[PDB]
């Protein structure tokens, strides 16, 4: 099983940071501790941070959506009623605006209100089917409710897929030095983690759905699944959940090309999705990031809000998190991965675990190494590996080829 080639040379595992924290000047007036970060993005509406731009629902043309909260239908609410000619024109206007100069980066299109496959629209997303029936009734009265509901599915699938394929293809052939992709695709659906006898193993039908959603993967360049966490799970439950999500995200990458699979930039968060103020301790970071470094992903993209990046106390707390927990772990895993490559593979790629249903990881043995901070904030790594570390890695782990270094 091969793997994608690195976008930036001398970096096999890449990090992206997409949050509006570009304003706050960290601590001691130092603006940026982002040396480890190859790509830095800013979602502010007027901002022009090239690295990782992202077009939300409110931009990039005339995207239709019925607001779930009490609100009005916008641009029709269904992909059936859209002009499909003004959309591409305003999208061209937006593409001209948000990247006047062509530069390397990844653009993500954040559109989730409806899902382009029928039968994934259980409550509260049943609305897009209600309307999808009644419109047909307003065109023909011969057909009963059964026939109207049947023909509803043939005015939402075609509509949505012709929407998104074209919204990409005005991006892929125009400014191809960027990396285009939709947010949160694929998905597997793990919501049964409270019932007894829980194993996160995605149910059969969801795998069938994403397997037959194969038309979209042939369009985008990069994938961006979500490996979010909440505080209702247990250690084993969280490990299995993350493991299976990422494993599916890696299996869906075999289809668009079977020799040089895509880049998977795991969209993650450093905050619990149930409590949006409590960070992840190091053990949670293990089965969030280390389970990703150790399964073959091309990199990790973190995401934020303004919830933890507006107040100055928030700036201080995030500065402490960066200087105590996150950056040391980033160097830990990255240096483990680069050492794996250079020693055990001769840099033919990145190494991937033998049996995934296991708690093996890519970490630096504390009895040999020392990751420290010298004065000035530039990290330094001291120490070299022993032979026993390489032996245990070469038994647990194994390597595989790159897309260019086979």
């Amino acid at each position, epitope marked *: 099983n091969f793997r994608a080639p690195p976008v930036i040379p001398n970096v096999p595992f890449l990090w992206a940071w997409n949050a509006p924290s570009e304003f706050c000047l960290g601590k001691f007036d130092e603006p940026l501790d982002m040396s480890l970060f190859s790509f830095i993005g800013s979602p502010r509406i007027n901002a022009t941070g090239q690295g990782v731009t992202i077009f939300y629902v409110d931009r990039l043309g005339y995207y239709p959506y019925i607001d779930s909260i009490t609100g009005v239908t916008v641009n029709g609410g269904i992909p059936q009623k859209i002009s499909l000619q003004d959309h591409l024109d305003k999208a061209k206007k937006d593409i001209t605006f948000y990247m006047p100069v062509d530069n390397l980066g990844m653009a993500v299109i954040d559109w989730e209100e409806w899902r382009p496959t029928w039968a994934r629209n259980w409550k509260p997303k049943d609305v897009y089917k209600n309307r999808s029936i009644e419109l047909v009734q307003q065109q023909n009265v011969q057909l009963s409710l059964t026939e109207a509901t049947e023909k509803a599915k043939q005015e939402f699938e075609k509509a949505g897929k012709d929407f998104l394929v074209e919204t990409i293809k005005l991006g892929k052939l125009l400014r191809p030095n960027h990396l285009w992709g939709y947010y949160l695709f694929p998905d597997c659906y793990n919501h049964h983690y409270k019932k007894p006898g829980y194993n996160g193993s995605c149910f059969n039908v969801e795998i069938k759905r994403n397997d037959d959603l194969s038309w979209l993967w042939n369009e985008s360049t990069a994938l961006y699944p979500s490996i979010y966490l909440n505080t209702q799970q247990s250690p084993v439950a969280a490990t299995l959940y993350v493991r299976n999500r990422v494993r599916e995200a890696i299996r869906v990458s075999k289809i668009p090309d079977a020799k040089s699979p895509l880049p998977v930039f795991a969209y993650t968060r450093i905050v619990f999705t149930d409590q949006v103020l409590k960070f992840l301790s190091q053990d949670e970071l293990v089965y969030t990031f280390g389970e990703t470094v150790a399964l073959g992903a091309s990199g990790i993209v973190i995401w934020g809000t303004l919830s933890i990046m507006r107040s100055m106390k928030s700036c201080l707390l995030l500065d402490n998190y960066m200087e105590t927990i996150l950056n040391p772990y980033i160097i830990n895993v990255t240096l483990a991965a680069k*050492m794996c490559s*250079q*020693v*055990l593979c001769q840099e033919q790629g990145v190494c991937i675990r033998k049996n995934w249903n296991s708690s093996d990881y890519l970490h630096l043995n504390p*009895d*040999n*190494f*020392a990751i420290q901070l010298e004065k000035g904030g530039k990290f330094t790594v*001291r*120490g*070299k*590996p*022993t*032979l*026993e570390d*390489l*032996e245990q890695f*070469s038994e647990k782990f194994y390597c595989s080829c790159y897309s260019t270094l086979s």
Partner: antibody
Amino acid sequence: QSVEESGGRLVTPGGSLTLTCTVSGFSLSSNAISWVRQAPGKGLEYIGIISTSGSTYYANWAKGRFTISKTSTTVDLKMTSLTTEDTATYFCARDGAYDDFAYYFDLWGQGTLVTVSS
Amino acid sequence: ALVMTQTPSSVSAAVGGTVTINCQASQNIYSGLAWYQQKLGQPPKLLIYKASTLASGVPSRFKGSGSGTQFTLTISGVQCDDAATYYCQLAYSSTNVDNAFGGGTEVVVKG
């Protein structure tokens, strides 16, 4: 930079001894240091190695007798239970940092002679 | 127990090109194996600082080659200027159980 050994002398069986190795032109936190011995008319034998993080590695024939240490400038070796089998010339080697995950020694010293007799 | 064995222990090859001194092992060693040269009465000198890479200042066009558990150092240009005794050492920080340096090789030149 330079590497210079010292401390080699005459000793009596059953005792203990200490050697020093002095450096100039660099720092001990960026380059590692190794101790090797050579018996007269025989081969080199590996006594130990000191990493950049303070970790000390020895060979299994030497564990329980030998101990290395560092300072701001000098790297010292200390030994115990001296018999007639320990007569040799002791060198001090510096790692020239050709590789990021292995030790390779480029700058050597001159050597100190240790004589064990009654 | 990591045991590294040198054969031969003394080579006698006239002017021309002489043999490649060897080095064996019992635990897998990828590429951390260095070769040194020592004339009598002098400290050694680093010649090959991997299984194959030469250091600056090696005009005798040496070239080492190998990987796995068996390794060699080839003496391409031998004259009355390259007479010494050679050695192989494992380059990774020694495991708990180790034996790094070998039995040594000697070069006899029949001028």
